[PDB]
Amino acid sequence: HGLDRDTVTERVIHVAKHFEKVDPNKITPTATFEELGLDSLDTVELVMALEEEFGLEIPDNEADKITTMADAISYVVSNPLAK
Amino acid sequence: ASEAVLRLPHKLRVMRMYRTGLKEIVNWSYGRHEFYPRANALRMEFEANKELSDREQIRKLVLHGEDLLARFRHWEPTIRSEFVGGTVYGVWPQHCKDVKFVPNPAYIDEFKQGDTVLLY
Amino acid sequence: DEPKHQIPGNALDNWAFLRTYAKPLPDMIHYYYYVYLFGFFFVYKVADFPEYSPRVLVMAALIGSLFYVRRDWVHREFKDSP
Amino acid sequence: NYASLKADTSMDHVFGDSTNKLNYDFQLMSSKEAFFWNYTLYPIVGFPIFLYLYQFNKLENFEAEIAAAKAAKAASE
Amino acid sequence: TLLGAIFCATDALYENYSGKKSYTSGMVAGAATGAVFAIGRPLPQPLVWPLV
Amino acid sequence: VKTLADYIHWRNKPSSIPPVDEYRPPVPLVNYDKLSTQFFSKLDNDPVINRVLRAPKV
Amino acid sequence: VPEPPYAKYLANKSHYCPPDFHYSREIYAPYGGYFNDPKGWRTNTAIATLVMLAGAYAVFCFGNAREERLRAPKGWIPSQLWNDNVPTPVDYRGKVL
Amino acid sequence: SSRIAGDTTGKYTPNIFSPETPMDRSFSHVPKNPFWEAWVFRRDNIQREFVWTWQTIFDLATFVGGLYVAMYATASFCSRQNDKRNGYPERNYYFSDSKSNFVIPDEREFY
Amino acid sequence: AGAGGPVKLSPPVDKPLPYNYDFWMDNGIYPGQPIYDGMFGSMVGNMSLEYMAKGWLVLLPILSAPFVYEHCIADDVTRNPFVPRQYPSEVREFLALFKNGFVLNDYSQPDYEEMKRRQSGLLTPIY
Amino acid sequence: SGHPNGSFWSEGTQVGLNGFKYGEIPLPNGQPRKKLWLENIWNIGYGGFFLGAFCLYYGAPPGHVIPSQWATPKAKDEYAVDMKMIDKYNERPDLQARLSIVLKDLNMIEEEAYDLIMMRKDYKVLLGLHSGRVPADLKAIYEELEA
Amino acid sequence: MFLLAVYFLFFSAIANGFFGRYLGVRGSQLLGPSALFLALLCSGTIFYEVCIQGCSTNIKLFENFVYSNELNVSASFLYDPLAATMTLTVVWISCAVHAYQNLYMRGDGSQTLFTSYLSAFTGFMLILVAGQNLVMLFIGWEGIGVCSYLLIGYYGSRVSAVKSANKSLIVNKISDGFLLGSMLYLWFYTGSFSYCSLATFQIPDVVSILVLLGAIGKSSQLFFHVWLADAMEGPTPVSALIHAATLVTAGIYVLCKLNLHSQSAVGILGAATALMGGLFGLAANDLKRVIAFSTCSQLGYMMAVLSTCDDGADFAMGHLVSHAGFKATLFLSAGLSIAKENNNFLNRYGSRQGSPTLSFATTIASLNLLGFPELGGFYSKESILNNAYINQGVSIILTLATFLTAFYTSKVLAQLYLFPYGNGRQQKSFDIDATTLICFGLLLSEMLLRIFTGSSLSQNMTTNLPAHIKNLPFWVALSGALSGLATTNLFSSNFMRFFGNRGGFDVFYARKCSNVFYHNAYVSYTLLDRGFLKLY
Ligand SMILES: CCCCCCCCCCCCCCCCCC(=O)OC[C@H](COP(=O)([O-])OCC(O)COP(=O)([O-])OC[C@@H](COC(=O)CCCCCCCCCCCCCCCCC)OC(=O)CCCCCCCCCCCCCCCCC)OC(=O)CCCCCCCCCCCCCCCCC
Ligand SMILES: CCCCCCCCCCCCCCCCCC(=O)O[C@@H](COC(=O)CCCCCCCCCCCCCCC)COP(=O)(O)OCC[N+](C)(C)C
Ligand SMILES: CCCCCCCCCCCCCCCCCCCC(=O)O[C@H](COC(=O)CCCCCCCCCCCCCC)COP(=O)(O)OCCN
Ligand SMILES: CCCCCCCCCCCCCCCCCCCC(=O)O[C@H](COC(=O)CCCCCCCCCCCCCC)COP(=O)(O)OCCN
Ligand SMILES: CCCCCCCCCCCCCCCCCCCC(=O)O[C@H](COC(=O)CCCCCCCCCCCCCC)COP(=O)(O)OCCN
Ligand SMILES: CCCCCCCCCCCC(=O)SCCNC(=O)CCNC(=O)[C@H](O)C(C)(C)COP(=O)(O)O
């Protein structure tokens, strides 16, 4: 089922909050992980946590291309198996 | 390490090691409860060596971690069912449109259907 | 387009090899005349040959077949040279 | 006419790209290894043959030894 | 003449040594003659000429 | 000595040579694929593995 | 794509068919379609049941004709109600019943 | 762009001049691939790539001739055992050199 | 949803095919497989045949240790603290006929030797 | 989900043709499809073959189609005779000794004694007795057991 | 009356598979279960007449099925005490599975064809069990083989499923080739194919080895167990039938029907299979695979018990019929769990609100598997373990196998119920209708009746053993259960990896046997007939 952008945005924002370093207002629908304060190893954990949230398996090469809040939402919206 | 992992840049190579290690923690666990402490332990294992700048030592750590991740590949990867390597992948694949169906086949030139021997 | 057999060799080199068969052709009567004469005399002499074992006869036939040179082979390879 | 040689990239992001290829050379077992494994497995297949050979040899040897002892006993006596 | 000499000599020598008239004398004489035929010849021919 | 053996087309050499470039089928990627040929290794009891897997309290 | 004229003769998607699942409706299979549920299924099931029971009656006659009991049962068996070739029961001690 | 060629009523005519492509038997033909066709051609004409090598001779002999030799030996052993079992004299088989003429048992005789 | 799930289609062949491409089984869905898994390509668990052979070399002596003692080291008199089941003569004679019987090991019996030779019977039919 | 009307015993939701059998399109007005040229000839010929095969397999007298059917009564009579003779052989030990001598000359083992009683009327024994291969005592032994 | 059950099953198969267009999905959902219910009544009558009241019957359908010279075989059915028991168990389990498939397979396209396959599958099992001669048994044997081929590969668009079906077919082909050899031996030297004249007190070893090699195929023993694990590709109703009664038990039934086995081979092979199956089930992480390895272990127990004593055949059959019940329950509950969680991996299962019936059925079946006292499985397993004490080597291996069985059974129970929820936060649901409840009620009734009626006549007969010897299996099972609940590590990572690869039996076949097979094919074709013998 094609899941709409608004819900995907809410759930990705919900996942991004759990990092302690990230401050709850810095996360916006269009923000890169660097401005949020996330490191590379942190981005791994965020991509994985997105995998549990939407019940999908991110193939690794696409996982590298996810570096921003925006493109993660775009990838989740693109996926037809995203829940 | 595979060729595709080797061709990757350093930053992405360490990222791959962390991702594969986390997935193998998931595979070797008995439940979600085991996952969190082991995930924190892997976190600390990577954080310990992040500030090293000596290239040769870093190469040693990356190679050893790659050997460790190669040996502890699980016989049974935990994969979601709808994805490649999953149980329900391809059970009843959705059939596409634009199918070439020949209506009333036996009534197209019914008397003269058959094989002919053509000669010079 | 269809799958086709690969032809070994270059086109011009193969054509050059084939062009070595285009040489002055003798008429076959010259060979035939000698074969007829020596064959007649040979048939006369054969009745006087000793009786040979069948095994030796077959081996002689095999050796003759192996040693026989086709007339085209001499045609392609003949050189008017020492 | 011919089928298109262009692949479909719609599902690459979901299920991964097709860039990674097989490492197999698509070649068979070496002749030396094949000789060993044929001449090992085929005897295992023919296990009744060797059982019959063993028992027949045993029977014939016992019969011949009986015959020899019989000849010895029937010579003196 | 050399090929025929090998053939006949090997045939007679084998029959004398064996003492019996058999197929094997002809096969061995032919094998020797075909071996002499293919001394320096390429790979199929060491097998085919002894056989023929 | 000219003989039939000289002009018989003996199969010493391949008439057809296969194309060099060959299709390798696509396969799902395994990141780390080195083979384990040693049943007993130091890697099983490596200090990292002990810290990552065996040590953490569950 | 505008559905072909014969699509009117073809039947619809059944209630059990998932809405997302697409199948070609023109394909004929003796075991049925992808989700079936034909109109008139109840009468067809009744006819199938009648044929099943009639064949059961014929098989029952055949088996009873060919059911051979050569050793007496230890006790009373249900077959005595319908088949008369059952030997009279004898118990473990040996007494006839 | 397509039309139904077949007519069950029997009023079938082939519209060779029709603008629309008939749905004839060629409608369902498989599209085919260039490289698959060349693979089929290569595989059928594999005699072109046949080369006499010592490895090839080794393989052919060891498997084909080896299996023939093994089967012949096993059959000869079975024939010998059956001759001992039946009580027949040793039979004159073709390549066995036996000084006995026994080939076919006499039905009338008791062995 | 069991039916209607998305699938990836395997790319069409675009390069000359190997002669032994029949070793690859592809139905059109992306993850094609060898004809027999483990014949070539990725190995499950990254374990080679050498590793499995070494593991079996470790296991077999321990697994075979219980069996070797009774079958080889032990003898009928010392295998068990009792004799086989004692039967009336008419029953015992019939039961001793069975080559796969359990009364053939009765060393108390005066027909022990013949019973043991019966137990170690013919490998193949003589006729 | 569930059942269409919530009741399992409700009318089917699918109206029309589940598929096109043989690929043929139903005629609009219900006009029957024109039959193929070979249908009548094919049905008549192959049905005739199968019906004739049935009739000949079952109608024909015994021994006409299945030869073993002819032998069944003869085998019953032979079975009765053999039963009587083997019963007599077991009772009389003098006959057992004589048949023991007969068996040895025929290169037969003693356990084949029942076999010889069962091959009284066969090519091998009948002609060997005439030729001299079989001892003439076997004739008397057969007669002493009522042939 | 005796014929009726096979008629009902084959009628269900023909009706659903050839006229399913008219019947429909609902039409299958009635005609299947109703016909098997009627067959269950007929099988109950058969069981009462033959087993309890000792009245065997022979039904000859027709004579001269094959009549070539002396070779003569007839289509006849003999319902002897073994056959009635296996028939009752098979029909009970198959009726349960047919009730199960009404809701489970509703989301599958060809539910009618699936029902038809299931019913013909049961019918061929009953043909195998009730045959009076070897040829009828071979007919049923090949029928169940082909039905397994058509059921494991039901999902044709999955390469793994079709390859699993091919694996099953090839392995079973080798096994029945050995059986056909043994059949020919027995006809030649006994004069008949019927089991009555089949009896030989002394048989040459070749016939015994051929019988054993044929039996170890369907009853998956060592070197022939590769297909059972891969048989998980098929739908869950298929797995329950094949592992519970139809396929695995057939070899044991053949070995019990004809006592031509040798004590030395059967005991060693069975004990090895039990230990290896338990060890393999230790590593497995799919719910369905662990239960298959447990099936392998139980088959090992049953094969081992034949060597112990004269009553070993009775004990093996009793464990067979007891095992069918709780194993079928375990597969059906596992399949329902997979549907409810949309998952096959044990890690992500967890505690969640569900039906009391399904959880209780899972608990009781697992308790029977473990050996919990005063249960049907407990008696049938202690009858084997206690009577195996005389064979010291067999007894030790079976006791370690009991420990391993307890460990992985308790681990599976803790992971399915006691463990916290491990799956994701998504809407997943499988609501169970009354038909599935009737299915599990039938299984639970079978389990309960097994306790009161027993499995073998000598089940409670005394084995004159010291108390500490007799009650030892309980202590080993309890220790295994306690270690499994704690989820402790038992083996090093190397041996855990070795067991996860199932001993590498398949990798050896891949690397040596298959490569030699296709090199023989290469020599035969490319080098020779399309090579040396092909013109330019
Ligand atoms: C100064 C004058 C010059 C001449 C000098 C001699 C003068 C004559 C004197 C006396 C003549 C009478 C006796 C001579 C032989 C009779 C032939 C004849 O006269 O015909 C007229 C002939 C011309 O006639 P034509 O019609 O114009 O030519 C027709 C051809 O197409 C011609 O066209 P082509 O040449 O282009 O094509 C040749 C073709 C023509 O075909 C033939 O030559 C047919 C010959 C077959 C055998 C003939 C019958 C043998 C029976 C002999 C009987 C005695 C022994 C009894 C027991 C033997 C049992 C078999 O054969 C070939 O392609 C080449 C192969 C040659 C033999 C083929 C058989 C091979 C078998 C070996 C197998 C081993 C290979 C295994 C590996 C393979 C790998 C896959 O004149 C001659 O050729 C005479 C030349 C004398 C040289 C012969 C050398 C040996 C002679 C005795 C050996 C017998 C074997 C025969 C060898 C080939 C002979 C042709
Ligand atoms: C013993 C006396 C009684 C005999 C009754 C036998 C039971 C039924 C026999 C019916 C005829 C048997 C042969 C039927 C045709 C064989 C083909 C077949 O069975 O199935 C066909 C198609 O099935 C049919 O249309 C007809 C089947 C009707 C009933 C079949 C019952 C099972 C067959 C019995 C096995 C034959 C025994 C032969 C060996 C003894 C193909 O199935 P799949 O390859 O699995 O693909 C189907 C699609 N899908 C991927 C979604 C699964
Ligand atoms: C047309 C026949 C030509 C043979 C074709 C075979 C294949 C050709 C390959 C060339 C190899 C050379 C020929 C050898 C063939 C002979 C068979 C070997 C058997 C053998 O060694 O026994 C000898 C007798 O067999 C014999 O020597 C006589 C056997 C006759 C040969 C077989 C005849 C039927 C073959 C037909 C096959 C199909 C035809 C297609 C070609 C020895 O006997 P011994 O008496 O010397 O005892 C020994 C006391 N010292
Ligand atoms: C140029 C082409 C040829 C070159 C390459 C050839 C290399 C192959 C040579 C080995 C072939 C296998 C071995 C068979 C021949 C053995 C030597 C022959 C002599 C012989 O007959 O001895 C018998 C061998 O046992 C036997 O009876 C046979 C046992 C082996 C057969 C079973 C092994 C494979 C099973 C596979 C199935 C094949 C057979 C199927 C029926 C036993 O001696 P004896 O007591 O019989 O007395 C007979 C008096 N010499
Ligand atoms: C409980 C009852 C028994 C259960 C089964 C037990 C089986 C035990 C057999 C294994 C133990 C002995 C193994 C032989 C010693 C070899 C030790 C080193 C192995 C080695 O170096 O080469 C290996 C050869 O494969 C091999 O070693 C294959 C030899 C196996 C003999 C056939 C026995 C059947 C085995 C079936 C299950 C065993 C799976 C593991 C073997 C790998 O070869 P490579 O691929 O690296 O070669 C390169 C390709 N050019
Ligand atoms: C199931 C068993 C699991 C197996 C686990 C085995 C895994 C082995 C783990 C130990 C191996 C290592 O430490 S591999 C550690 C390799 N060491 C280095 O790379 C030093 C240089 N570090 C950097 O360049 C960056 O800090 C970087 C870290 C890339 C991030 O970039 P960010 O600054 O932007 O976050």
Side-chain angles (χ1 to χ4, degrees), chain B residues 92, chain G residues 30-31, chain K residues 10 13-14 17-18 110 113 116-117 120 124 127 139 142-143 146-147 150 153-156:
Chain B
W92 278 96
Chain G
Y31 45 93
Chain K
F10 280 143
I14 301 299
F18 281 126
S110 296
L113 190 58
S116 179
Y117 286 166
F124 280 119
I127 290 189
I139 296 169
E142 295 294 328
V146 292
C147 287
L150 282 72
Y154 208 77
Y155 303 138

Side-chain angles (χ1 to χ4, degrees), chain D residues 33 37, chain I residues 49-50 52-54 56-57 60 63, chain K residues 222-223 272 276 503-505 507-509 511-512:
Chain D
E33 199 167 5
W37 287 109
Chain I
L49 183 63
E50 184 169 294
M52 300 313 284
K54 292 181 181 179
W56 262 125
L57 277 162
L60 294 174
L63 187 153
Chain K
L222 183 63
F223 295 98
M276 293 318 291
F505 283 79
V507 72
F508 171 70
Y509 298 149
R511 300 292 178 90
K512 300 303 164 250

Side-chain angles (χ1 to χ4, degrees), chain K residues 410-429:
Chain K
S410 296
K411 182 174 72 68
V412 175
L413 294 174
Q415 293 179 356
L416 268 164
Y417 298 113
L418 293 165
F419 269 23
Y421 196 61
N423 220 343
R425 193 169 20 81
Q426 293 82 17
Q427 305 199 0
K428 65 179 72 66
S429 66

Side-chain angles (χ1 to χ4, degrees), chain K residues 21 258 377 379 477 494:
Chain K
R21 294 178 65 88
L258 61 84
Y379 287 106
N494 64 7

Side-chain angles (χ1 to χ4, degrees), chain D residues 52-65:
Chain D
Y52 277 81
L53 268 164
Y54 177 74
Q55 184 177 2
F56 197 40
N57 273 259
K58 185 183 286 185
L59 188 63
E60 282 180 312
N61 297 340
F62 189 46
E63 274 175 283
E65 183 178 1

